[PDB]
DNA sequence: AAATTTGTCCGTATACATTTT
DNA sequence: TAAAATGTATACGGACAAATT
């Protein structure tokens, strides 16, 4: 019964994607609407966590996934960037 | 190296929790209180008796399997190598 | 069967290490 | 130089997945 995110139990079609996946969708949206152009910086990990209201590890999980599929690349001490 | 309780003239340190668990388990083995192919206490038992999280237990045990002191069988249990 | 037990996923918190800037 | 930003380590919690017993 894949946990995902659940607001409530009863009836229907059930509930939301995990937090990190929601974050993934948002970031990937920024890239694919071109609000963030190739080689440009995404708002940082700290910033991201303050705006999304999630842990740094949730942010890092989303970003890491997006790096693995090659949409982002990150530079230690530098920042994170559009691929 | 990682832990403390902060006081003057120096700083008081202790091993991280998982390290303490490691020492305990490995001492059980090296004193022969547990013999090859015998199972150690379950991760659940260990967390309840040591008062730490299942991940602290799993971390210690993981380090001890990497050394070949232990081996675990999923659904089976954990054993002295 | 179905309960135990170990394995992995998801989420949170704090501290410190490593590089850039 | 330090500050900032990413990386890894140490904890904790809950829920689910997989294989044994």
Total E-strand runs of chain A: 2
Please give the count of helices of chain A.
3
* Largest sheet entry of chain A: 2 strands, antiparallel
Looking at the overall shape, the CATH architecture of chain A is Orthogonal Bundle
Strand content of chain A: 5-15%
The helix fraction of chain A, in percent, is: 40-55%
Query: How many structural domains in the coordinates of chain A?
Result: 1
The CATH topology of chain A comes to Arc Repressor Mutant, subunit A
Q: For this structure, what is the CATH homologous superfamily of chain A?
A: Winged helix-like DNA-binding domain superfamily/Winged helix DNA-binding domain
Tell me about this structure.
2 copies of one chain form a homodimer. The N and C termini of chain A lie far apart (35 Å). Chain A has helices at 19-32, 45-52, 56-68; strands spanning 72-75, 79-82. A two-stranded antiparallel sheet of chain A has the order 1-2. With 83 residues, the first copy, chain A, is mainly α. Chain A has one domain (1-83): Arc Repressor Mutant, subunit A (Orthogonal Bundle), CATH 1.10.10. In chain A, strand 1 (72-75) and strand 2 (79-82) form a beta hairpin. In chain A, helix 1 crosses helix 3 (56-68) and helix 2 packs across helix 3. The longest helix of chain A has 14 residues, at 19-32. Chain A binds a DNA duplex (21 and 21 nucleotides) through residues 1-5, 18-20, 44-46, 54-58, 60-61, 74-80. Chain A: Residues 45-64 bind DNA. Chain A: It is found in: Cytoplasm. Chain A: Residues 16-83 form the HTH gntR-type domain. Chain A: Transcriptional repressor of the arabinose utilization genes. Also regulates its own expression. Binds to two sequences within the promoters of the araABDLMNPQ-abfA operon and the araE gene, and to one sequence in the araR promoter. Chain A: This is Arabinose metabolism transcriptional repressor.
């Amino acid at each position: 019964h894949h946990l995902e995110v659940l607001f409530q139990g009863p009836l229907g079609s059930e509930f939301m994607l995990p937090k990190y996946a929601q974050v993934k969708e948002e970031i990937s949206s920024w890239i694919n609407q071109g609000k963030i152009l190739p080689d440009q910086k995404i708002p940082t990990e700290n910033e991201l966590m303050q705006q999304f209201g999630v842990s740094r590890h949730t942010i890092r999980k989303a970003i890491g996934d997006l790096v693995s599929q090659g949409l982002l690349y990150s530079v230690q001490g530098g920042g994170t960037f559009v691929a």
